[PDB]
Design a protein around this motif. Structure first.
Motif, PDB file in Angstrom:
ATOM      1  N   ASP A 102       0.752  -1.105  -0.020  1.00 48.86           N
ATOM      2  CA  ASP A 102      -0.013  -0.043  -0.218  1.00 48.86           C
ATOM      3  C   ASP A 102       0.795   1.288   0.006  1.00 48.86           C
ATOM      4  O   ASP A 102       1.863   1.225   0.739  1.00 48.86           O
ATOM      5  N   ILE A 103       0.653   2.314  -0.856  1.00 51.29           N
ATOM      6  CA  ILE A 103       0.843   3.599  -0.840  1.00 51.29           C
ATOM      7  C   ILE A 103       0.130   4.827  -0.539  1.00 51.29           C
ATOM      8  O   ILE A 103      -0.766   4.995  -1.394  1.00 51.29           O
ATOM      9  N   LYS A 104       0.526   5.512   0.402  1.00 48.09           N
ATOM     10  CA  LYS A 104      -0.218   6.706   0.682  1.00 48.09           C
ATOM     11  C   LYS A 104       0.827   7.921   0.578  1.00 48.09           C
ATOM     12  O   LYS A 104       1.542   7.952   1.143  1.00 48.09           O
ATOM     13  N   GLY A 117      10.475   8.759  -4.482  1.00 46.70           N
ATOM     14  CA  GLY A 117      10.148   8.537  -3.122  1.00 46.70           C
ATOM     15  C   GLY A 117       9.911   6.983  -3.011  1.00 46.70           C
ATOM     16  O   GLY A 117      10.190   6.499  -1.704  1.00 46.70           O
ATOM     17  N   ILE A 118       9.172   6.430  -4.014  1.00 46.82           N
ATOM     18  CA  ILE A 118       8.667   4.959  -3.755  1.00 46.82           C
ATOM     19  C   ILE A 118      10.093   4.315  -3.706  1.00 46.82           C
ATOM     20  O   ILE A 118      10.385   3.354  -2.990  1.00 46.82           O
ATOM     21  N   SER A 119      11.232   4.764  -4.495  1.00 50.36           N
ATOM     22  CA  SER A 119      12.524   3.937  -4.565  1.00 50.36           C
ATOM     23  C   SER A 119      13.020   4.128  -3.093  1.00 50.36           C
ATOM     24  O   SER A 119      13.873   3.048  -2.755  1.00 50.36           O
ATOM     25  N   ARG A 120      13.063   5.240  -2.320  1.00 52.02           N
ATOM     26  CA  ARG A 120      13.610   5.537  -1.359  1.00 52.02           C
ATOM     27  C   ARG A 120      12.731   4.323  -0.405  1.00 52.02           C
ATOM     28  O   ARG A 120      13.792   3.438   0.210  1.00 52.02           O
ATOM     29  N   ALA A 121      11.413   4.475  -0.152  1.00 55.55           N
ATOM     30  CA  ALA A 121      10.655   3.606   0.753  1.00 55.55           C
ATOM     31  C   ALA A 121      10.571   2.136   0.483  1.00 55.55           C
ATOM     32  O   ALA A 121       9.937   1.269   1.181  1.00 55.55           O
ATOM     33  N   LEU A 122      11.311   1.740  -0.864  1.00 57.18           N
ATOM     34  CA  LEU A 122      11.425   0.259  -0.855  1.00 57.18           C
ATOM     35  C   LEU A 122      12.403  -0.496  -0.009  1.00 57.18           C
ATOM     36  O   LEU A 122      12.793  -1.482  -0.214  1.00 57.18           O
TER      37      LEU A 122
END
Length: 84
Positions: free
Chosen positions: A18-20, A38-43
């Motif tokens: 899930d992504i908010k 940002g997604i790449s960070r939080a992977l």
RNA sequence: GAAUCGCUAGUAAUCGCGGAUCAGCAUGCCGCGGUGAAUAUGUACCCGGGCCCUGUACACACCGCCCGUCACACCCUGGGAAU
């Protein structure tokens, strides 16, 4: 959309997370790039094992082509008037 | 048209946005951001610069010096009939 879904069309059937999110500033390509990285960070939910699958294709680093300013005298950062 | 100019990645091109001086004002200038590539064959060429090796009568340094006829003025001189 295809651009922002590529980051998880690998080692993920899309049916796991899930992504908010949120984003501001800049333009239509700026904001999409920002969200992508940002997604790449939080992977880093699996920290020491996902950068393996990511760095190979290059899903980790910013585009450091931030805009080049305007210098004096010219009309742009490299365009120049015409001498005779 | 001949030509000629500008540029090798957030750049070219376009998209607007924002100041500037100033009551009245920008197709100008300065700045800011949107979007966004072509092409890297590299020194063959014209081009430009440097090196150093040679040649020069150039040193205002080749856009340099510079020869010769003709037209021009002054001066001097030779041949010269006949004297």
């Amino acid at each position: 959309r295809a651009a922002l879904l590529r980051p998880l069309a690998e080692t993920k059937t899309l049916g796991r997370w899930d992504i908010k999110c949120t984003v501001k500033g800049g333009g239509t390509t700026g904001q999409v790039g920002a969200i992508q990285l940002g997604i790449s960070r939080a992977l880093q939910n699996w920290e020491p094992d996902m950068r393996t699958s990511l760095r190979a294709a290059g899903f980790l680093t910013r585009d450091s082509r931030v805009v080049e300013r305007k210098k004096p005298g010219k009309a742009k950062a490299r365009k120049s008037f015409q001498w005779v």
